[PDB]
Write a protein that binds this ligand. Sequence first.
Ligand SMILES: [Mg+2]
Ligand SMILES: [Mg+2]
Ligand SMILES: [Mg+2]
Ligand SMILES: [Mg+2]
Ligand SMILES: [Mg+2]
Ligand SMILES: [Zn+2]
Lengths: 322, 217, 63, 132
Amino acid sequence: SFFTKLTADELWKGALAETGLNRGQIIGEGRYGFLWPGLNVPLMKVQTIAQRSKEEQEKVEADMIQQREEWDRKKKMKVKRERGWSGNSWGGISLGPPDPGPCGETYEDFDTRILEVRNVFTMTAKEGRKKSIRVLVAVGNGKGAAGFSIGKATDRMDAFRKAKNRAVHHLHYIERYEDHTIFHDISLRFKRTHIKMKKQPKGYGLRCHRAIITICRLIGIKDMYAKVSGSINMLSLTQGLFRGLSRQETHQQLADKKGLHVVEIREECGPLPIVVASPRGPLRKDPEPEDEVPDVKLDWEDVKTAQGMKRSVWSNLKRAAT
Amino acid sequence: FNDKILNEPLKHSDFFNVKELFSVRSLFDARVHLGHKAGCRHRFMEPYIFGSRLDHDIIDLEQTATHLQLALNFTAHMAYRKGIILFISRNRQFSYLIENMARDCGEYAHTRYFRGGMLTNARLLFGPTVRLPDLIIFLHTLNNIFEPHVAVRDAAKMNIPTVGIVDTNCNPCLITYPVPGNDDSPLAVHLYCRLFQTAITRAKEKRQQVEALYRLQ
Amino acid sequence: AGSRLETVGSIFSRTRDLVRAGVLKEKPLWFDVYDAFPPLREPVFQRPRVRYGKAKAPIQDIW
Amino acid sequence: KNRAARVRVSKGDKPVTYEEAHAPHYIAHRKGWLSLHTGNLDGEDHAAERTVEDVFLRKFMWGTFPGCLADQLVLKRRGNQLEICAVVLRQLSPHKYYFLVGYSETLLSYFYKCPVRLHLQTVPSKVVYKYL
RNA sequence: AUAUACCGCCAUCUUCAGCAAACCCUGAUGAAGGCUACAAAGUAAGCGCAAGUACCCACGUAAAGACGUUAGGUCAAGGUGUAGCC
Ligand SMILES: [Mg+2]
Ligand SMILES: [Mg+2]
Ligand SMILES: [Mg+2]
Ligand SMILES: [Mg+2]
Ligand SMILES: [Mg+2]
Ligand SMILES: [Zn+2]
């Protein structure tokens, strides 16, 4: 009957089943050809109640068919989503610049990239499996300063903004020998993860781990060799990357911890001894005790490469351009 | 553009002449040299120990005077720079004094139970725009349980410099201007509330002096 | 922005460095006074390690 | 859990109205009856059809004012006179609203044989009571 | 035909007191955790208890009882997804 008919909200509620349409119809159209002086006409001026013909109606009813279909083809569009480290994986996915604060304090230079997503679970008292999503981002604008923090919430979209708005408040200033690299070959361990990270000249490209590519492009470091061994757990890699990029001795510090001028020799150059840093203040008249072959406990994987005995079919690969 | 009264007293050294308000004789008779026993003597405080006379650690007052002059120099420049100044203490013996000290000067205090996250959740626990207190003075860096007070770790995090009266129990690593001294004896704190009040009351009237000088100019 | 790492450097080593990368659009007001009268110690956080072997405290006893 | 008229709280992003933010044991305490006729007294007749006259109008006006009928209707009756108080949206042009006032006030009046007298009230947005 | 697609109306724990968005901290920034009034990190809109309201009182019995638990129950109240018969 008539009273069995009902409103629209109780229709989609019953059909979508999220508990475990009306945009084109203007109020003046009717299926029978009809006009009224109130609406569907030149307003108040045709001023007579009159009807249409039949095949004119067959021209405007066919129009409604092409409007809905074109609007439905606009619903059926594949978004040109940027591929971060793979398809169907929130790897190096770029979010927008992070959100402005409650007074001002814009962050328009910064960029946020995801590092790892994880559908983490915990069996709770009532509900059972409580799925939360545990995301990890890194902030950085180039320019030597960066940071990273984690987000953990019950939804995908809400956990991202947690991690963005945290990491802009947790920043390091990663210093650089002029922009493209670091100061010395540094090798550390963050609880299990031996990371060897050595300084490289220009043009080398970021031949380093898939995370560390998409972190140093946010710091500005353009090329550096970084072999990570042991365990590769994405959060423990990044907290090992960030300390040894901060526990870092600039050339003005290497002087001022020792006095003496720091000289550098470039192989593509001659023996031209360019000073990079002199100490701010005194100068020591004692040259260094040049004890050769010192007890610097060097690695093993650098000697086999400097000897060139060993080999790997993935040792030197013609990979793409970062 | 009135940076000419702001750029001047950093080139000066001891612009307030705060060194006339304290001396090593005047410090000793406030018993600032006394400390706790030699069991709970903190490992980061052994630079600031004179020695252990009969299981009692005495503080180098020649090292306090080169700290107290550098500590009272800081708080005098900042009250001159109309900065906001707090006083955090949790001893319950001087909770009347360091509050009544703060009412005597023009600065603020917080002498009771620190609600967890008062500085780091400031824009929610207070209104959405709040001027953070750009100096913090500790008179007891310990709680009523002898743990470092929680504001020594939040003021480091919220990036505002803190001064303190660091004793033989506590950790001076996060206090940006340590003063090694006694704090649990009342004649210490009567002089300790004396020097941190005089140095900022002179700092207020010195600010009002120089501004009318360039306003008469 | 801010940087609330109380371990990776002191509050001067961050506030000098976050204004060298230019992320802070205005310096704090205490910043120039540390640039005028620095303390005798760099206030960085160090973990309190504990004496184990033949390594006592280098203090003396007053007699 | 009874689920009569209670909108469920799920997030703070559903704007609820004052008539919808009350559970149906509040019909005398914090609400009133949306309609008004003398049917359900004791003991008086003409209650049986006067609800069928009542449920028809709340299924009619929601059609002819589509997407712009903000809250529920107030269907009163004073003898051979019935007023319709009605809150609407300020989105449609007032040449079309007056056309609907003049059309419906002479349509149902010849249908139920009584002077129907619709009187409108405009609110621009939805009067949100709680953000659950 | 399918309550093992659902709305709609409910049963149960419920004669409960919890659930919670949003931020902050602690765990070397791991799953997570966040209690100490002579107080060591929590703050909290919002919901429910409570409080008000009905009945003969402020008592009482009603009414109320969130989020969830059992693919609880109902296509046979009505509507309706999918598949079917015409
Ligand atoms: Mg793919
Ligand atoms: Mg019940
Ligand atoms: Mg009952
Ligand atoms: Mg109740
Ligand atoms: Mg079942
Ligand atoms: Zn003490």
